Amino acid sequence: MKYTICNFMMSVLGIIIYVTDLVADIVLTVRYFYDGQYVFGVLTLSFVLCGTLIVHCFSYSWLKDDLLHCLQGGVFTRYWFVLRTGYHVVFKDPHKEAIDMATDLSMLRLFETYLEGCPQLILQLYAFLERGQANFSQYMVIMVSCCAISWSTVDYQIALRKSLPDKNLLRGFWPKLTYLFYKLFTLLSWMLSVVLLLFVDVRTVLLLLLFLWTVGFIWAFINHTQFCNSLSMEFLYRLVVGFILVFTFFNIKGQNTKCPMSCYYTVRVLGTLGILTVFWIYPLSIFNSDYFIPISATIVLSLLFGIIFLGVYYGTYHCRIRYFLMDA
Amino acid sequence: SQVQLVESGGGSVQAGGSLRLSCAASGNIADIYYLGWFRQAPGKEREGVAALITYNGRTYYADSVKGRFTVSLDNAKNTVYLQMNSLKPEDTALYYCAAAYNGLIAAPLKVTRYWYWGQGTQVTVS
Ligand SMILES: CCCCCCCCCCCC(=O)OC[C@H](COP(=O)(O)OCC[N+](C)(C)C)OC(=O)CCCCCCCCCCC
């Protein structure tokens, strides 16, 4: 609550994660263009660029609401003030201002991570699984995005415990570990699931994205979510949160009764297992049996542990962030 | 790049004749699964002429040249040889030899399937 030194190290660790993630994408995008993979190149740059542009819209709106100029209040600008405030706390209500600026940053980097990392990890797993061995530069992007998702999920988890007192039971090292391994395991099962579908027909998978994007868009509209003061700006948040629910659940508005999450993951469990049965009962000549059965074990076992970690989460635990995504 | 490809045998052959092209892999190919050939001429994209598996030897072909070419691999020199018979003018193209590591996708004809390629040789048919 007092923005301890460990929290400052969380902020310091973030700036390396942010800069390395940005520079790796630029290096990877240049590598693709040098290697002739234009399609993989523009997509790699599009996800980081479109992810950054969306986050900048929230960042500029939040600064303007509480208040050239468009880029003067970007994500990088927020980092510099947070580092200054964190250093002042170490040298020494300043803590309340410091933690408030930190939680505002956690929201933005969660969107930045899940609007870029999730669409890119599918792309990189598509490129790594197709050519077999990949290269060193592709490994850095996969690892940093895996760290960016891992780091952002923990930092966002810490922000909830400190901002609103409702998450009082969340204190402890274990809950930030079970939830972290929750997100990796349930995503890795879904990341590999989409990639398998992404090999047979790319067009159909993107059509399924739109159907799952609209459902997420509709559900938040049904849930009457309100996060942004501006009417026009809020639909951007409604549209974005729908995209995130395509990959992982986030319990919009945090006022649900655990029913939508169960209905979401019931579709996930039968949907993921339903895909494999089609690929198992009906063999596919495209796929290779030698490498497929490692994947089939990987996708099921990760989902098997992913659900178990989710069950552990509820069996033990369950001013501005009260409207952001909460719960699991 | 510990592994490199050396290609030779390209040239100009009268239509209806025969031509043999050699492609040698320098380095290690212990885990190399696929390796085949492609042809490049202006005005169209790469297409898989033929391919084979280092382990088994199943010679996957293309419908355009099925039952016409003979591709084989000899493990003594780690070299792959492709033979052409009854050449036609449309066969004139830049022929690239490439190899691919093993992976989930089993399709030894996709251009993007293969990992590293070679310089290639020119083949002319009159
Ligand atoms: C936040 C989102 C997370 C995403 C980031 C992480 C990306 C991970 C890359 C996955 C690629 C992949 O699955 O590769 C497929 C491999 C290949 O199988 P192999 O037989 O070992 O091939 C090796 C054969 N050699 C020796 C000829 C090369 O399968 C694996 O063993 C990967 C499993 C890793 C996850 C472990 C958890 C579950 C254990 C189940 C194992 C049976």
Coordinates of C-alpha atoms and ligand atoms in Angstrom, one line a residue:
Chain A
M1 CA 0.0 0.0 0.0
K2 CA 3.1 2.2 0.6
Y3 CA 4.7 1.3 -2.8
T4 CA 7.5 -0.7 -1.4
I5 CA 10.9 -1.3 -3.0
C6 CA 9.7 -4.6 -4.4
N7 CA 7.0 -2.7 -6.3
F8 CA 9.6 -0.3 -7.7
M9 CA 11.6 -3.3 -8.9
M10 CA 8.4 -4.4 -10.6
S11 CA 8.2 -1.0 -12.3
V12 CA 12.0 -1.2 -13.2
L13 CA 11.7 -4.7 -14.6
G14 CA 8.8 -3.5 -16.8
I15 CA 10.8 -0.9 -18.8
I16 CA 13.3 -3.6 -19.9
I17 CA 10.4 -5.8 -20.8
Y18 CA 8.7 -3.0 -22.8
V19 CA 11.9 -1.8 -24.6
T20 CA 13.1 -5.3 -25.4
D21 CA 9.7 -6.3 -26.7
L22 CA 9.6 -3.3 -28.9
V23 CA 13.1 -3.7 -30.2
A24 CA 12.7 -7.4 -30.8
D25 CA 9.7 -6.8 -33.0
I26 CA 11.6 -4.2 -35.0
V27 CA 14.5 -6.6 -35.3
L28 CA 12.2 -9.5 -36.2
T29 CA 10.2 -7.4 -38.7
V30 CA 13.5 -6.3 -40.4
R31 CA 14.6 -10.0 -40.4
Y32 CA 11.4 -11.1 -42.1
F33 CA 11.7 -8.4 -44.8
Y34 CA 15.4 -9.4 -45.3
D35 CA 14.4 -13.1 -45.4
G36 CA 11.6 -12.4 -47.9
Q37 CA 8.7 -13.3 -45.6
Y38 CA 6.7 -10.1 -46.3
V39 CA 3.4 -11.6 -45.0
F40 CA 5.0 -12.6 -41.7
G41 CA 6.8 -9.3 -41.6
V42 CA 3.9 -6.9 -42.0
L43 CA 1.8 -8.9 -39.6
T44 CA 4.5 -8.9 -37.0
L45 CA 4.8 -5.1 -37.2
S46 CA 1.0 -4.6 -37.5
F47 CA 0.2 -6.3 -34.2
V48 CA 2.7 -4.2 -32.2
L49 CA 1.7 -1.0 -34.1
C50 CA -2.0 -1.6 -33.8
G51 CA -1.6 -2.6 -30.2
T52 CA 0.4 0.5 -29.4
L53 CA -2.1 2.8 -31.2
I54 CA -5.1 1.4 -29.3
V55 CA -3.3 1.8 -25.9
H56 CA -2.2 5.4 -26.8
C57 CA -5.9 6.3 -27.3
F58 CA -6.7 5.2 -23.7
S59 CA -3.5 6.9 -22.4
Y60 CA -4.2 10.2 -24.1
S61 CA -7.9 10.1 -23.1
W62 CA -7.0 9.5 -19.4
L63 CA -4.5 12.3 -19.2
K64 CA -6.8 14.7 -21.1
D65 CA -9.8 13.7 -18.9
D66 CA -7.8 14.5 -15.7
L67 CA -6.3 17.6 -17.2
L68 CA 3.0 17.3 -30.5
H69 CA 0.4 16.8 -27.8
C70 CA -0.9 13.6 -29.2
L71 CA 2.5 11.8 -28.7
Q72 CA 3.4 14.0 -25.8
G73 CA 1.4 11.8 -23.4
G74 CA 2.2 8.4 -24.8
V75 CA 3.0 5.2 -23.0
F76 CA 6.7 6.1 -22.9
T77 CA 5.9 9.4 -21.2
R78 CA 4.0 7.6 -18.4
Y79 CA 7.0 5.4 -17.7
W80 CA 9.3 8.4 -17.1
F81 CA 7.1 9.9 -14.4
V82 CA 6.5 6.6 -12.7
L83 CA 10.3 6.0 -12.5
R84 CA 10.8 9.5 -11.1
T85 CA 8.1 8.9 -8.5
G86 CA 9.4 5.5 -7.6
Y87 CA 12.9 6.9 -7.1
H88 CA 11.5 9.6 -4.9
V89 CA 9.7 7.1 -2.7
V90 CA 13.0 5.1 -2.3
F91 CA 14.9 8.3 -1.3
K92 CA 12.2 9.3 1.1
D93 CA 0.4 11.8 -0.1
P94 CA 3.3 11.0 -2.5
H95 CA 2.7 7.2 -2.2
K96 CA -1.0 7.6 -3.2
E97 CA 0.0 9.5 -6.3
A98 CA 2.7 7.0 -7.1
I99 CA 0.5 3.9 -6.8
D100 CA -2.3 5.6 -8.7
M101 CA 0.0 6.3 -11.6
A102 CA 1.3 2.7 -11.4
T103 CA -2.2 1.1 -11.6
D104 CA -3.1 3.4 -14.5
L105 CA 0.0 1.9 -16.2
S106 CA -1.0 -1.6 -15.4
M107 CA -4.3 -1.3 -17.4
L108 CA -2.5 0.1 -20.4
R109 CA 0.2 -2.6 -20.5
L110 CA -2.4 -5.4 -20.0
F111 CA -4.1 -4.1 -23.2
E112 CA -0.8 -3.7 -24.9
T113 CA 0.2 -7.2 -24.0
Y114 CA -3.0 -9.0 -24.9
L115 CA -3.7 -7.0 -28.0
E116 CA -0.1 -7.7 -29.3
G117 CA 1.3 -10.8 -27.5
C118 CA -1.7 -13.0 -28.1
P119 CA -2.2 -12.3 -31.8
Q120 CA 1.6 -12.5 -32.3
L121 CA 2.3 -15.7 -30.4
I122 CA -0.2 -17.4 -32.7
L123 CA 1.7 -15.9 -35.7
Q124 CA 5.1 -16.9 -34.3
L125 CA 3.9 -20.4 -33.3
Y126 CA 2.6 -20.6 -36.9
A127 CA 6.0 -19.7 -38.3
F128 CA 7.9 -21.9 -35.8
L129 CA 5.7 -25.0 -36.3
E130 CA 5.7 -24.8 -40.1
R131 CA 9.4 -24.5 -40.9
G132 CA 10.4 -26.8 -38.0
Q133 CA 13.5 -25.2 -36.4
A134 CA 12.8 -21.4 -36.7
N135 CA 15.7 -19.1 -35.9
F136 CA 17.2 -17.2 -33.0
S137 CA 15.4 -13.9 -33.6
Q138 CA 12.0 -15.6 -33.6
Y139 CA 12.9 -17.2 -30.2
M140 CA 13.5 -13.8 -28.6
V141 CA 10.0 -12.6 -29.7
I142 CA 8.3 -15.7 -28.4
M143 CA 10.3 -15.6 -25.1
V144 CA 9.7 -11.9 -24.4
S145 CA 6.0 -12.1 -25.3
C146 CA 5.8 -15.1 -23.0
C147 CA 7.5 -12.9 -20.4
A148 CA 5.4 -9.9 -21.3
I149 CA 2.2 -11.9 -20.7
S150 CA 3.7 -13.4 -17.6
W151 CA 4.9 -10.0 -16.3
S152 CA 1.8 -8.0 -17.1
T153 CA -0.5 -10.6 -15.6
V154 CA 1.4 -10.5 -12.3
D155 CA 1.6 -6.7 -12.3
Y156 CA -2.1 -6.3 -13.1
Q157 CA -2.8 -8.8 -10.3
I158 CA -0.7 -6.7 -7.8
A159 CA -2.6 -3.5 -8.9
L160 CA -6.0 -5.0 -7.9
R161 CA -4.8 -6.0 -4.4
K162 CA -3.5 -2.4 -3.8
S163 CA -6.2 -0.3 -5.4
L164 CA -9.4 -1.6 -4.1
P165 CA -9.9 -3.3 -0.7
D166 CA -12.3 -5.8 -2.1
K167 CA -9.4 -8.1 -3.0
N168 CA -8.2 -8.4 0.6
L169 CA -7.8 -12.2 0.5
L170 CA -5.6 -11.9 -2.6
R171 CA -2.5 -11.2 -0.4
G172 CA 0.2 -13.8 -0.8
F173 CA 2.9 -15.2 -3.1
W174 CA 0.9 -18.2 -4.1
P175 CA -2.2 -16.5 -5.7
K176 CA 0.0 -14.5 -8.1
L177 CA 1.7 -17.9 -9.0
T178 CA -1.4 -20.0 -9.5
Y179 CA -3.1 -17.3 -11.5
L180 CA 0.1 -16.8 -13.6
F181 CA 0.4 -20.5 -14.4
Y182 CA -3.3 -20.4 -15.0
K183 CA -3.0 -17.9 -17.9
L184 CA 0.0 -19.6 -19.5
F185 CA -1.6 -23.1 -19.4
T186 CA -5.0 -22.1 -20.6
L187 CA -3.5 -19.9 -23.3
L188 CA -0.9 -22.4 -24.5
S189 CA -3.7 -25.0 -25.0
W190 CA -5.6 -22.3 -26.9
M191 CA -2.6 -21.0 -28.8
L192 CA -1.7 -24.5 -30.1
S193 CA -5.4 -25.2 -30.8
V194 CA -5.8 -22.2 -33.1
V195 CA -2.5 -23.0 -34.8
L196 CA -3.7 -26.5 -35.7
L197 CA -6.9 -25.0 -37.2
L198 CA -4.7 -22.3 -38.8
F199 CA -3.0 -24.9 -41.0
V200 CA -6.0 -26.5 -42.6
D201 CA -7.9 -23.3 -43.5
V202 CA -6.8 -19.8 -42.6
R203 CA -9.9 -18.1 -43.9
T204 CA -12.3 -20.2 -41.7
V205 CA -10.3 -19.5 -38.5
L206 CA -10.4 -15.7 -39.1
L207 CA -14.2 -16.1 -39.6
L208 CA -14.4 -17.8 -36.2
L209 CA -12.4 -14.8 -34.8
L210 CA -15.1 -12.4 -36.0
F211 CA -17.8 -14.6 -34.5
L212 CA -16.0 -14.8 -31.2
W213 CA -15.1 -11.1 -31.4
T214 CA -18.8 -10.1 -31.9
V215 CA -19.8 -12.3 -28.9
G216 CA -17.3 -10.6 -26.7
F217 CA -18.3 -7.2 -28.1
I218 CA -22.0 -8.1 -27.6
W219 CA -21.5 -9.5 -24.1
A220 CA -19.8 -6.3 -22.8
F221 CA -22.7 -4.3 -24.4
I222 CA -25.1 -6.7 -22.6
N223 CA -23.0 -6.3 -19.4
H224 CA -23.4 -2.5 -19.6
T225 CA -19.7 -1.9 -19.0
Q226 CA -18.6 1.7 -18.3
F227 CA -14.9 2.6 -18.1
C228 CA -14.4 5.8 -20.1
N229 CA -16.1 9.1 -19.5
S230 CA -16.4 9.8 -23.2
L231 CA -19.2 8.0 -25.0
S232 CA -17.2 7.5 -28.2
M233 CA -14.1 6.4 -26.4
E234 CA -15.9 3.8 -24.3
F235 CA -17.0 1.8 -27.4
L236 CA -13.2 1.4 -28.2
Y237 CA -12.8 -0.2 -24.7
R238 CA -15.9 -2.3 -25.4
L239 CA -14.5 -3.4 -28.7
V240 CA -11.1 -4.1 -27.3
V241 CA -12.3 -6.2 -24.3
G242 CA -14.2 -8.3 -26.8
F243 CA -11.0 -9.2 -28.6
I244 CA -9.3 -10.2 -25.3
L245 CA -12.1 -12.6 -24.4
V246 CA -11.4 -14.5 -27.6
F247 CA -8.2 -15.9 -26.0
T248 CA -8.7 -15.7 -22.2
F249 CA -11.6 -14.8 -19.9
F250 CA -11.5 -11.7 -17.7
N251 CA -14.9 -11.4 -16.0
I252 CA -16.0 -8.0 -17.3
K253 CA -17.3 -5.6 -14.7
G254 CA -16.4 -8.2 -12.0
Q255 CA -20.1 -8.4 -10.9
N256 CA -20.8 -11.8 -12.5
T257 CA -21.8 -14.9 -10.5
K258 CA -19.1 -17.2 -11.9
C259 CA -21.7 -18.5 -14.3
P260 CA -20.3 -16.9 -17.5
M261 CA -16.8 -18.1 -16.8
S262 CA -18.1 -21.7 -16.4
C263 CA -20.1 -21.3 -19.6
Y264 CA -17.0 -19.9 -21.4
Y265 CA -14.7 -22.6 -20.3
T266 CA -17.2 -25.3 -20.8
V267 CA -17.2 -24.3 -24.4
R268 CA -13.4 -24.1 -24.2
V269 CA -13.0 -27.7 -22.8
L270 CA -15.5 -29.3 -25.2
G271 CA -14.3 -27.0 -28.1
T272 CA -10.7 -27.9 -27.6
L273 CA -11.4 -31.6 -27.2
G274 CA -13.9 -31.5 -30.0
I275 CA -11.2 -30.3 -32.4
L276 CA -8.8 -33.1 -31.5
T277 CA -11.5 -35.8 -32.0
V278 CA -12.0 -34.5 -35.6
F279 CA -8.3 -34.6 -36.1
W280 CA -8.0 -38.0 -34.4
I281 CA -11.0 -40.0 -35.6
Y282 CA -10.5 -38.5 -39.0
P283 CA -6.8 -38.5 -39.9
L284 CA -5.3 -35.6 -41.8
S285 CA -2.8 -36.2 -44.5
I286 CA -1.4 -32.6 -44.0
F287 CA -0.2 -33.2 -40.5
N288 CA 2.7 -35.4 -39.5
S289 CA 2.0 -38.2 -37.0
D290 CA 5.5 -38.0 -35.5
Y291 CA 5.1 -34.4 -34.2
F292 CA 1.3 -34.3 -33.9
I293 CA 1.1 -36.6 -30.9
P294 CA 3.5 -34.5 -28.9
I295 CA 1.1 -31.6 -29.7
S296 CA -2.0 -33.6 -28.9
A297 CA -0.6 -34.5 -25.5
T298 CA 0.6 -30.9 -25.0
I299 CA -2.7 -29.3 -25.7
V300 CA -4.8 -31.6 -23.6
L301 CA -2.4 -31.8 -20.6
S302 CA -1.9 -28.0 -20.6
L303 CA -5.7 -27.5 -20.6
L304 CA -6.0 -30.3 -17.9
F305 CA -3.6 -28.4 -15.7
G306 CA -5.1 -25.0 -16.7
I307 CA -8.5 -26.0 -15.4
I308 CA -7.0 -27.5 -12.3
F309 CA -5.2 -24.2 -11.5
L310 CA -8.5 -22.3 -12.1
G311 CA -10.2 -24.6 -9.6
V312 CA -7.5 -24.0 -7.1
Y313 CA -8.0 -20.2 -7.6
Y314 CA -11.7 -20.3 -6.5
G315 CA -11.2 -23.0 -3.9
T316 CA -8.9 -20.8 -1.8
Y317 CA -9.6 -17.1 -2.6
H318 CA -13.1 -16.4 -4.0
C319 CA -10.9 4.2 -7.3
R320 CA -10.5 3.8 -11.0
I321 CA -9.9 0.1 -11.4
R322 CA -13.4 -0.7 -10.0
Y323 CA -14.6 -0.6 -13.6
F324 CA -11.7 -2.4 -15.2
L325 CA -11.5 -6.1 -15.8
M326 CA -11.4 -8.0 -12.4
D327 CA -11.6 -11.5 -11.0
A328 CA -10.0 -14.3 -13.1
Chain B
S1 CA 24.9 -21.1 -41.4
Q2 CA 26.7 -24.4 -40.7
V3 CA 24.8 -26.0 -43.6
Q4 CA 25.1 -24.8 -47.2
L5 CA 23.8 -26.1 -50.6
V6 CA 25.9 -26.5 -53.7
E7 CA 24.1 -26.9 -57.1
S8 CA 25.5 -27.9 -60.5
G9 CA 24.5 -29.5 -63.8
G10 CA 22.3 -26.7 -65.1
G11 CA 22.5 -25.8 -68.8
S12 CA 20.8 -25.6 -72.1
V13 CA 19.2 -28.8 -73.5
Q14 CA 17.3 -29.2 -76.7
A15 CA 13.6 -29.9 -76.2
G16 CA 12.7 -33.6 -75.9
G17 CA 16.1 -34.5 -74.5
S18 CA 17.3 -35.2 -71.0
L19 CA 19.2 -33.3 -68.3
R20 CA 20.5 -34.2 -64.8
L21 CA 21.1 -31.8 -62.0
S22 CA 23.1 -32.4 -58.8
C23 CA 22.6 -30.8 -55.4
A24 CA 25.1 -31.5 -52.5
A25 CA 24.5 -30.5 -48.9
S26 CA 27.6 -29.4 -46.9
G27 CA 27.4 -29.9 -43.1
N28 CA 25.1 -32.1 -41.1
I29 CA 21.7 -33.4 -42.4
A30 CA 21.0 -35.8 -39.5
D31 CA 17.8 -34.1 -38.5
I32 CA 17.0 -32.8 -42.0
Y33 CA 13.7 -34.4 -43.1
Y34 CA 12.6 -33.0 -46.4
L35 CA 14.7 -31.8 -49.4
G36 CA 13.5 -31.1 -52.9
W37 CA 13.6 -28.8 -55.9
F38 CA 11.7 -25.8 -57.2
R39 CA 11.7 -23.9 -60.5
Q40 CA 11.7 -20.1 -61.0
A41 CA 10.9 -18.3 -64.3
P42 CA 9.7 -14.8 -64.7
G43 CA 5.9 -14.3 -64.4
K44 CA 5.1 -17.0 -61.9
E45 CA 5.7 -18.2 -58.3
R46 CA 7.9 -21.0 -57.0
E47 CA 6.4 -24.5 -57.4
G48 CA 7.6 -27.8 -56.0
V49 CA 9.1 -29.9 -58.7
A50 CA 9.9 -32.9 -56.5
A51 CA 11.0 -33.9 -53.0
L52 CA 12.1 -36.8 -51.0
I53 CA 12.6 -37.9 -47.4
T54 CA 16.1 -38.6 -46.1
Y55 CA 14.8 -41.2 -43.7
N56 CA 12.3 -43.2 -45.8
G57 CA 12.8 -42.0 -49.4
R58 CA 9.2 -41.4 -50.4
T59 CA 9.5 -39.3 -53.6
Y60 CA 6.7 -36.8 -53.4
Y61 CA 6.0 -35.3 -56.8
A62 CA 3.9 -32.7 -58.5
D63 CA 1.0 -33.2 -60.9
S64 CA 2.6 -31.1 -63.6
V65 CA 5.7 -33.4 -63.8
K66 CA 4.4 -36.6 -62.2
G67 CA 5.7 -39.8 -63.8
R68 CA 8.4 -37.9 -65.7
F69 CA 11.3 -37.0 -63.3
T70 CA 13.4 -39.3 -61.2
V71 CA 14.8 -37.9 -57.9
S72 CA 17.0 -40.0 -55.6
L73 CA 19.4 -39.4 -52.7
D74 CA 22.7 -41.2 -52.0
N75 CA 23.8 -41.1 -48.4
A76 CA 27.5 -41.9 -49.2
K77 CA 28.1 -38.3 -50.3
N78 CA 24.9 -36.7 -48.8
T79 CA 23.9 -35.6 -52.3
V80 CA 20.6 -35.5 -54.1
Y81 CA 20.2 -36.0 -57.8
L82 CA 17.2 -35.0 -60.0
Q83 CA 16.8 -36.3 -63.6
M84 CA 14.6 -34.8 -66.3
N85 CA 13.3 -36.5 -69.4
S86 CA 11.3 -35.3 -72.4
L87 CA 12.0 -31.6 -71.7
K88 CA 9.6 -28.9 -72.9
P89 CA 10.1 -25.2 -73.3
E90 CA 8.0 -24.4 -70.2
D91 CA 10.6 -26.3 -68.1
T92 CA 13.1 -23.5 -68.7
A93 CA 13.4 -21.9 -65.3
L94 CA 15.8 -21.2 -62.4
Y95 CA 15.9 -24.4 -60.4
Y96 CA 16.5 -24.0 -56.6
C97 CA 17.5 -26.9 -54.3
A98 CA 16.4 -26.6 -50.6
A99 CA 16.0 -28.7 -47.5
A100 CA 13.7 -28.5 -44.5
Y101 CA 13.8 -29.7 -40.9
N102 CA 11.1 -32.0 -39.6
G103 CA 8.0 -30.4 -38.2
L104 CA 4.3 -30.7 -37.6
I105 CA 3.3 -29.8 -41.2
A106 CA 4.0 -32.7 -43.6
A107 CA 3.8 -31.1 -47.1
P108 CA 7.1 -31.3 -49.1
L109 CA 5.8 -29.0 -51.8
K110 CA 4.9 -25.7 -50.1
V111 CA 7.4 -22.9 -50.8
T112 CA 7.3 -21.7 -47.2
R113 CA 7.7 -25.2 -45.8
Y114 CA 11.4 -25.3 -46.4
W115 CA 13.9 -23.5 -44.1
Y116 CA 17.1 -22.9 -46.0
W117 CA 17.7 -22.8 -49.8
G118 CA 20.6 -22.7 -52.3
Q119 CA 21.9 -20.5 -55.1
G120 CA 20.3 -22.6 -57.8
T121 CA 21.2 -23.3 -61.4
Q122 CA 19.7 -22.2 -64.8
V123 CA 18.0 -24.7 -67.1
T124 CA 17.2 -23.8 -70.6
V125 CA 15.0 -25.8 -73.0
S126 CA 14.7 -25.0 -76.7
Ligands
LIG1 C1 1.6 -17.5 -22.8 C2 1.5 -18.5 -24.0 C3 2.6 -19.5 -23.9 C4 3.3 -19.8 -25.2 C5 4.8 -19.6 -25.2 C6 5.5 -20.9 -25.1 C7 5.7 -21.6 -26.5 C8 6.0 -23.1 -26.3 C9 6.3 -23.8 -27.7 C10 5.5 -25.0 -27.9 C11 5.9 -25.7 -29.2 C12 5.6 -27.2 -29.2 O1 4.6 -27.6 -28.6 O2 6.4 -27.9 -29.9 C13 6.1 -29.3 -30.1 C14 7.0 -30.1 -29.3 C15 7.8 -31.2 -30.1 O3 7.7 -32.5 -29.5 P1 9.0 -33.4 -29.3 O4 8.7 -34.9 -29.5 O5 9.7 -33.0 -28.0 O6 10.0 -32.9 -30.5 C16 11.4 -33.0 -30.4 C17 12.0 -34.0 -31.4 N1 13.4 -33.7 -31.9 C18 14.3 -34.2 -30.8 C19 13.7 -34.4 -33.1 C20 13.6 -32.2 -32.1 O7 6.3 -30.7 -28.1 C21 6.8 -30.5 -26.9 O8 7.4 -31.4 -26.3 C22 6.6 -29.1 -26.3 C23 5.9 -29.2 -25.0 C24 6.2 -27.9 -24.1 C25 5.2 -27.6 -23.1 C26 5.3 -28.5 -21.8 C27 4.0 -28.5 -21.0 C28 3.2 -29.8 -21.2 C29 4.0 -31.1 -21.3 C30 3.5 -32.0 -22.3 C31 4.5 -32.6 -23.2 C32 4.2 -33.9 -23.8

